Amino acid sequence: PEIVDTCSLASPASVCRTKHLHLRCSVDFTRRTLTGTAALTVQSQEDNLRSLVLDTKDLTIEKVVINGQEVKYALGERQSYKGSPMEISLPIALSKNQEIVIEISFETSPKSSALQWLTPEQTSGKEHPYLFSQCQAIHCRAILPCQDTPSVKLTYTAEVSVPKELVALMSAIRDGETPDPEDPSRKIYKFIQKVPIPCYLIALVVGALESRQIGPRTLVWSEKEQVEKSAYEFSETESMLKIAEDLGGPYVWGQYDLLVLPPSFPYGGMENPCLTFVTPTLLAGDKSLSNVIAHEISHSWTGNLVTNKTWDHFWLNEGHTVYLERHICGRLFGEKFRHFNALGGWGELQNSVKTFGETHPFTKLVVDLTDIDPDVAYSSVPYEKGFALLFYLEQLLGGPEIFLGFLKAYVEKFSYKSITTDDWKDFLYSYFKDKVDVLNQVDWNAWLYSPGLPPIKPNYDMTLTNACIALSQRWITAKEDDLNSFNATDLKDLSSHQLNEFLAQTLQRAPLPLGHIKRMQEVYNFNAINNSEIRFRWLRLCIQSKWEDAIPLALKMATEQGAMKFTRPLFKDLAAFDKSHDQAVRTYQEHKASMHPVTAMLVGKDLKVD
Template sequence: MAEVVDPSSFAAFRSCRIKHLNLKLRVDFAIRVIGGRAALTIESQQDELRELVLDTKDLKIHKVVVNGQETNFSLGETHSFKGAPLKITLPCELMRGQDVIVEVSYDTTPQASALQWLPPELTAGKKHPYLFSQCQAIHCRSIVPCQDTPSVKQTYYAQVSVPKELVALMSAVHDGEAPDPEDSSRKICRFKQSVPIPSYLLALVVGPLESRKIGPRTTVWSEKELVDEAAYEFGETESMLQTAEDLVGPYVWGQYDLLVLPPSFPYGGMENPCLTFVTPTLLAGDRSLSNVIAHEIAHSWTGNLVTNKTWEHFWLNEGHTVYLERRIGGRLFSEQFRHFQAVGGWKELKDSVGTFGAQNPLTNLVPSLNEVDPDVAYSSIPYEKGFAFLFYLEQQLGGPDIFVGFLKAYLHAFAYKSIITDDWKNFLYSYFKDKVDILEKVNWKAWMDSPGMPPIKPEYDMTLANACIALSQRWSKAAHCDLCSFNAEDLKKLSSHQRIEFLALLLQEEPLPVSHVKRMQEVYNFNAVKNSEIRARWLRLCIRCRWEEAIPLALKMATEQGRLKFTRPLFRELYNFDKARDEAVRTFLRHRPFMHPVSAMLVGKDLKVEPAHSTSF
């Protein structure tokens, strides 16, 4: 497989590789710091190795010991988003294939970008503090000195000291707990991850958690106020797991637990092995948003098992995961439903391309991230442009059953490895060696290396989409005198997914008159809907149509949860509405200290607000 450089990492992973990580951590809520000792088992990849380089960000390094011998180290110049390289001098030369154990004693800082520390008042229970991590894409270096690149995978073992009244969980199998011998008010929780993972999948949560078992290998965790609601919402998890196994082979991670995080979690879900993190915005009450769980389950194969080697090849993770997610949905519901989700995905892609600009190189399927923060590059492009490409190839190469055969073989061939697009493409040509003439007709440059929308739109079954299109066109074309023709019956036959699509279609049209959105509220009462996907699109539509009464509702949704999918578009719409702009900026500045560090940074950019020096409470 091709050798590449990771532009997002300082670590010289071609000269040496971490094989195992042994962590001893102490979580201190009083000062919002994790004290750590990381013992890294490192294998030399070359002869005469004299120096190691690890990624760090805002870490205080106290001491480095190599095979029991204290050694010299230095921190290089701090980069704006990559942190600072930790350079370690080895006491003696290492030869190729030789192992060494490097112990680094360190503390995190309260500004660690991977961590959000919540005081009790920002939790559901209001009694205990809460901590959670989010290491993707390049934030693991802010809690552990590491080779923070998806090119390197390692196993890990962790012992975590936490207040004894709280629960600690990690992206690993629980390996028991015991009283902390150094502090009677604390306990040590132990975890073991025996499947090698990239650093971005290291995860830690500490809080007042309760659990409910919902399947033979799945437990749902959250604060007690949400745990029963979550147990119902995610009750289909085992059937999704079994469907994925039927499609692409055995699930290798053992446990598949779910954790519902506090509302400030910036993503819909995070596929941490053995412990998927999810946002509470999925709790719609009717399981209508459970496709996010199918997506995170799919990552157990596409991303966690076979991983993009650098973030420039992120589509290998996300495009394949969306493809597998929708195959799961197609099996559980219908093939029409799979196509309907694909139609919605194409719309998401158009929205992202419109936001970036059709000539922006970050809309390439394989962009260059040289001096580009992966968080700033993050969008639905690798998800939906990647899916559209795979869906197009499926239609060219013989249909869904034939293409899932390729996907299963691909995952088997590259299991436990990190790869780039050329590795995938070479395997595609090898697998479909009898259809090379078809592959040669694919416009690879236009799909992979050109900005904007794909060169070809795949063919979709529009059965479920047509009702949404018809209703959206009625509203778009309605004169003021036609508004009385709309009533609550319009939505009766539309599922939650179709209602989302209806609003998404209106967001692609010229803004409606305010009279229309007022009438829509009268007859459909979208303000009362709990489904976050519907609510976010509805409020964006209202603000875009310049309905001033919706401003406080949009600000409320933008700040009561921190999911970037909702928060950023809502704030952007408010900023573009002259009568809401100043209030949007004031509201953001008021809430910024309580937001996740990544959310605060990205929304600040959207609102053209100077970055804060700290996001402390």
């Protein structure tokens, strides 16, 4: 059984394995570079190993030392998004299982696709710079030399020098701080991660950070002005943790802190161990976006403990996580809610499939990322098609309680490992051997390898969805002489989630007559809502329905925060509407330079600029 990681140019795990990383670096804000030494403890998996290759992307190598001596290495020619392979000639040949530590002195590019440097004006306090990282999927190679594949798991310790007045944090347990002996104007923050992790989980943030405790094992971190709001917004964290432990077994990471990043953080959240990163667009004031926390918490099991061997199997990470996420929210709020959210997810899947096209490669559950930048292929398919499969297996195998038993054993079975879709499928058949006849009734080839919507839609309770659909239908079928019937009381019995679903149902038939949209603002005043998911969908409906007054609102939301899930569709909508097209392109060109590297590149391709 042999599978290779097409996204990595490093020696695969079958040749050698990194067991530990000891990172000693200093954050240079004046140069926008991270400088230091990455000491890798590498174990040979072969006989007579004399050299190995590591992944790198836009790194500057000062030197490589093994056994106290500088050794030969050579950087191959760059291979676009994959970066440049770095071959290192080992001084002595290694036997199988033999280990050695290679210390690489390096410097990052201010252009690193893993990093975003922010001037003081880009932060909340306006007096200090800020730095944050984002390694998933394959950007760790852009911070330090390494076997940048999730098929290798290692532990790590790190010491980071940073201006005295700032604070550093990493995906690890804080192990102290002290003044920097070699430069009084700095502080050195120490960290240790004892649980083996794929390198894409390595994370670093440096900024004027403050914290506040919100649970027995949770501190919320952010700049001063976001602390209070965040502490309230994420107050359900410990209870969600307890439910997750009940579903997946013990939380093995020690602490579970939350870091609330500046508005340009590219994702809703990132499951960095010990320190989940979240977008500040979750600060709705009513905890209505807490499913994102339940999602990240879930990853502490599905993704961080059981990890996908290569990015071709990312759905293993996301599908199981969404599945656990919905059980946490179902426990907290009722099975009817889980079905509602499960049903909404199906709607997002239809959207993704319609967007890519139903035969498009990226709509396959298991994809072939050979020569495909993971950032370009990222979408809701692995999340929702993956979730759909498990929900479908759940109803096929006997209900939530039975499938949850398989989920826990699955986590137990593959803890601290990296697996493929086949490993998952073999264990499913093994666990449910006494139901193989049932298992043999699913169209595996279609589910796992065919593009488009799944060959079968699961069954969903519709109780909380009905009112949404009914209101959506009233608006869609309404003619001009029916617009007067609409009133603020139409929303009286709807929760913020039903409101969001109401918009999603309506967005799927966009555009609607411009007069219908104006009326909607008139009676429901959606312009006044700051819930980001709701506002996002409202502005898309407005732009797609060609209401020019929405342009400034859409452009504003698109640039004042950078969560790609909101920013990319907004710029795209703005660019497809002839009246805002030039302004969309122009706004992008002017913001590009101070945008997150990955977000800039992707919006750039969506707008077809440069």
